[PDB]
């Protein structure tokens, strides 16, 4: 699941990767349940890695569903309720107005819930872009992005191995710290767990502190070395990357359809829509495993003698030694001439 999610970034406009339905709590969940609290933690760390246009809203409404009976938010119509399943928000028209505008959530009524919303709006990861290929010789098969750009759903910085594991400047480390702190605030006063006869506040606190200060190198990897590997692999793929823009929370720019046209521009014919337009998402959905993604984010590691230059030279040699770009180019020639001859 981790590697497939990491690889589906290159195919945003064809396949959209959503978190599995089974990963959500059972029957909506509840904050009075330790199992559902750990469900929420395992789920909130895997969402930022999926190329789903509405991951933030699912992350918000998971806790909004768990929080029923103890906190409330304003609704939109007289049809839906705060306790509707968060996994049913798969299209931009379902985003709550109180989520798109923070100040509709009163802090005197939804303290934890507004804190979670504010965290989502401030510390959710930021998309970025990296250069790859050689557009001056190999051309470039990008359609909706500029000729040499590889969009990424996360930020990336230059690569060095000598950087602190507990660096809260990294977006993924910061996200983990924020989620652990919010769950800590949730469990502090026992305002939401009436029924725990014993006092599990200290135990919850200690385990959340461990999860926070775990010694993982996966966030550092994703920030620094993953984009380099993607950009090294991209120009050699048989089916080159096909992407659609990553909009963070700007709802009105979220892509919702991808069609193909075969008719001219100054004619009116049958509205024979393409066959890819009949998807609820932008592409063929595929579900991932939140548990696997979370455990992979928590437990990473490098070899204790990693030398970056040696490692990546030794890895780049045998895969460029087996390249087929120079045949794919001639194939593209023949395809273009075939299309024009058919017309």
């Amino acid at each position: 699941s981790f590697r497939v999610a990491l690889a589906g970034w290159l195919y945003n406009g064809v396949v959209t990767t959503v978190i599995d339905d089974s990963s959500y709590p059972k029957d909506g969940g509840s904050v009075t349940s330790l199992e559902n609290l750990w469900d929420f933690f395992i789920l909130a760390l895997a969402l930022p890695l999926t190329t789903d246009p509405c991951a933030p809203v699912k992350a918000f409404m998971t806790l909004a569903n768990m929080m029923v009976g103890f906190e409330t938010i304003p609704m939109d119509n007289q049809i839906y309720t705060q306790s509707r399943r968060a996994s049913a928000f798969s299209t931009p028209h379902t985003w709550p107005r109180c989520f798109m505008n923070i100040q509709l959530i009163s802090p005197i009524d939804a303290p934890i819930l507004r804190q979670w919303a504010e965290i989502i709006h401030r510390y959710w990861p930021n998309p970025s872009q990296i250069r790859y290929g050689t557009p001056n010789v190999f051309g470039s098969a990008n359609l909706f992005t500029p000729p040499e750009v590889l969009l990424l759903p996360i930020d990336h910085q230059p690569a060095n191995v000598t950087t602190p594991t507990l660096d809260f400047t990294n977006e993924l480390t910061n996200w983990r710290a924020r989620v652990c702190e919010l769950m800590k605030n949730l469990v502090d006063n026992q305002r939401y767990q009436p029924g725990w006869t014993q006092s599990l506040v200290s135990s919850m606190r200690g385990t959340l502190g461990k999860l926070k200060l775990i010694k993982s190198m996966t966030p550092m990897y994703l920030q620094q070395l993953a984009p380099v590997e993607l950009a090294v692999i991209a120009p050699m793929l048989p089916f080159p990357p096909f992407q659609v823009p990553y909009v963070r929370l700007d709802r009105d720019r979220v892509p919702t359809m991808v069609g193909v046209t075969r008719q001219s521009r100054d004619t009116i014919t049958q509205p024979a829509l393409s066959l890819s337009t009949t998807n609820t998402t932008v592409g063929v959905p595929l579900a991932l495993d939140a548990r696997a993604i979370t455990v992979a984010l928590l437990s990473g590691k490098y070899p204790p003698d990693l030398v970056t230059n040696v490692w990546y030279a030794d890895a780049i040699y045998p895969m460029y030694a087996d390249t087929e770009v120079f045949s794919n180019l001639q194939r593209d020639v023949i395809t273009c001439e075939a299309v024009q001859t058919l017309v």
Partner: protein
């Protein structure tokens, strides 16, 4: 005192063995080196139960040590203990200087 020779720490230790080459260390290298130091200091002194394991499950490059509790109204009390010297680290630095 030893980890600051191969890495970047926040303790003001002098450095003599900089003319010797060394890799750009990371978390794995630091943890490995610390484990070797621990095993050596067990083998000498003849110990068999957990000399330095509490500190090794973190990042040894920035190891500090302190404790605190917090009253209900947010007030906080901490105990940052003084760091007494170590004749073994003094002798190690002397041997490096020689």
């Amino acid at each position: 005192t030893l980890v600051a020779q191969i890495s970047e720490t926040q303790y003001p230790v002098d450095r003599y063995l900089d003319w010797i080459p060394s890799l750009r260390a990371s978390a794995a290298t630091a943890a490995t080196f610390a484990e070797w130091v621990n095993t050596s200091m067990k083998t000498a002194f003849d110990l068999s139960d957990m000399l330095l394991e509490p500190l090794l499950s973190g990042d040894p490059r920035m190891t500090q040590l302190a404790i605190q509790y917090q009253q209900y109204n947010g007030r906080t009390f901490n105990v940052i203990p003084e760091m007494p010297g170590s004749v073994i680290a003094d002798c190690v630095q002397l041997t490096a200087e020689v």
